[PDB]
Amino acid sequence: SGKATVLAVGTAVPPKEFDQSTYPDFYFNVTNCNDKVELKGKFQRICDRSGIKKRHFYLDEEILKANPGMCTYMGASLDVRQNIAVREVPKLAKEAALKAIKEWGQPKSKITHLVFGTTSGVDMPGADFQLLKLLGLRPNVKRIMLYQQGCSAGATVTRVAKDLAENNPGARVLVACSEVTAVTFRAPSETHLDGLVGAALFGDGAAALIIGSNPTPVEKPLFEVHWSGQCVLPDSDGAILGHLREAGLVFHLLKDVPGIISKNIEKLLAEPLDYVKSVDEASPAYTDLFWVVHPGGPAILDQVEAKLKLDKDRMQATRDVLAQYGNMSSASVLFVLDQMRKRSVELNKDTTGDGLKWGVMLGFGPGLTVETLLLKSI
Amino acid sequence: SSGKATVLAVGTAVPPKEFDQSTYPDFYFNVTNCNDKVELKGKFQRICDRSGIKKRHFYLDEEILKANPGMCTYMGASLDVRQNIAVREVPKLAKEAALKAIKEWGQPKSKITHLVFGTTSGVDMPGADFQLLKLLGLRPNVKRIMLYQQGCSAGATVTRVAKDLAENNPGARVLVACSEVTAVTFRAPSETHLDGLVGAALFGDGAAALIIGSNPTPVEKPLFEVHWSGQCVLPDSDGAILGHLREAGLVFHLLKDVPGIISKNIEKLLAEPLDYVKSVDEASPAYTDLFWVVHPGGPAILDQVEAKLKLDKDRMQATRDVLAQYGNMSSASVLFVLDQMRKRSVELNKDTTGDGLKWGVMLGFGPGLTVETLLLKSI
């Protein structure tokens, strides 16, 4: 009752598709690293088992050529990366938001709050202001701009929107996450093998939501947000580091992220499952929940599926997003929320959440931090 | 008049090294090897002389700067060393302010449920919010909101954010911290960048922290209640303050009269919170019947709002006290003013924490031009 409710979802990607099978050829070509046959072979193997069929990128041969800094491994390049990201992140978000807003069907003057998440560049005024402007929202929309957040921020913006919507009568929150790999793209290097991983998995994309409490008769609820939590996992210090430098944004992976999440995932779920027990007086198996999971990559999905003994269909909405768009950082989990709803229509499900009642939304980022939200289907 | 997010503690911290504003231009034009720029230095001395600042505190000094010549140039590449400094020092300064807040609060730190961190000084992953969680040893399941690259309005933003966290979650106690270090903005003066001289005159280092929660217990000590909160972009202000993060650091551009724009629109901003006060109290205070917790952007903003609203000269005094002793510490500043409001209430034997008055306005200003407005109630 009065719970923050997802009322619309919209998504956007750059038009240009990069087929994953051939991406090594393109990548090692533009970075003039063709002479590194053993490294290229390693990269092709990573791409081949990534579970990704294609990614969408704003970045193309023309732009990368016009800006050779970005085609180096660690040369100066932040300024052109910023020029690109500061401009394109809000633009891609407007596209997603206009689709959310259409779905919602209400006038945009009714939007009272905006939460913007990204890991791709920073500016003042922020991407949140640029989007307010691009959409012609009211000037007194209350904004929260979440910069440099990482892959957990799709979940983070839903958590933030939940308290805005629930504590403010009438509030209608526009949530937008938008990412463009302009700030992380770099030449592959034998001295940065963990860097191959991001190069294989990260793609561009934006996703938006409308969230509000007390949906009106003309609004259409998709999911309810019942419980929200965040935590730093044990023995995970330094797992993912991301340093914004003159060379742009560099990642360092120093621990087994899939394994750590796997190791702790039952613990993470304990309280949201207590809450369900409080309301439904029952205790579902993990496989009796639907899953809206950040597609960090195939290994996290496989190992959580194995650990929690999930029917193979449960990760399917997540893997669908991974297959078609790769890892778009914070926007990704909201793409999965959309896909979850889309398949409920196509596969004639009894609810928006794979025909089940309760669902788990999960995002993962530097910390190692996990965001957990308990959803209810409609 | 029950359940409103309440300030339960305030703590502040600044780097120990003090720089007298009178002689700041000597130091500044010297470490940047710009002594030949004598007319420029004259302009800067004048700007510093009318700034209303007696001293600032800085982490940066001659030794650090000389060890990092990139930072003493006008637009030379230096983001890497600036980040090295900011990513380290921003959460450390925040920790000191936060310990003071937690001390005043009086409760175990395990009862902290949320952390909101604001800064304009560097970015890292994990963020300064994570760093501060670790430095304080809070529970790993404290709920964090990390606000990077925000600018001068973020002291008020984190208070708007904390209000909803506290009010929608029963027994929530929110640690709020803003922390700023000028390592990312410091650079050589230049006749090509005259608006850079404003920032060089005004900006200082500092951090501040609150504890905020709804429904204070009898062992907690309320300072201020947050009754209303708004944020708005001002009309005809497009491009007034730009801030770009580049390879040479954070660069600021001032393309419009920020004090004029704020003054031109201030009464309109206040209409809605004053309607709230009319609804609750059935009468309309004059602006000078409120207490004022204002971001000390610089002397001109304070002077012009004071005049526009016909404020008694004493209303802006807590704000001016912070400008005098610390300068413009970006996001943190308005929370120093909140502290100073309470402090002068004790020492001047006021009837309430808010200069003896019931209702108060909190104002933060930043790029957009954005204004954060909060209505406070004193205790």
TrEMBL record, chain B:
Keyword Transferase: yes
Xref: InterPro entries: Chalcone/stilbene_synt_C, Chalcone/stilbene_synt_N, Polyketide_synthase_type-III, Thiolase-like
Alphabetical UniProt keywords: Acyltransferase, Transferase
Residue intervals of the Chalcone/stilbene synthase N-terminal domain: 1-216
Modified residues (Cysteine sulfenic acid (-SOH)): 152
Signal peptide: none
UniProt family annotation: Belongs to the thiolase-like superfamily. Chalcone/stilbene synthases family.
Protein name: Chalcone synthase
Species whose genome carries this gene: Selaginella moellendorffii (Spikemoss)
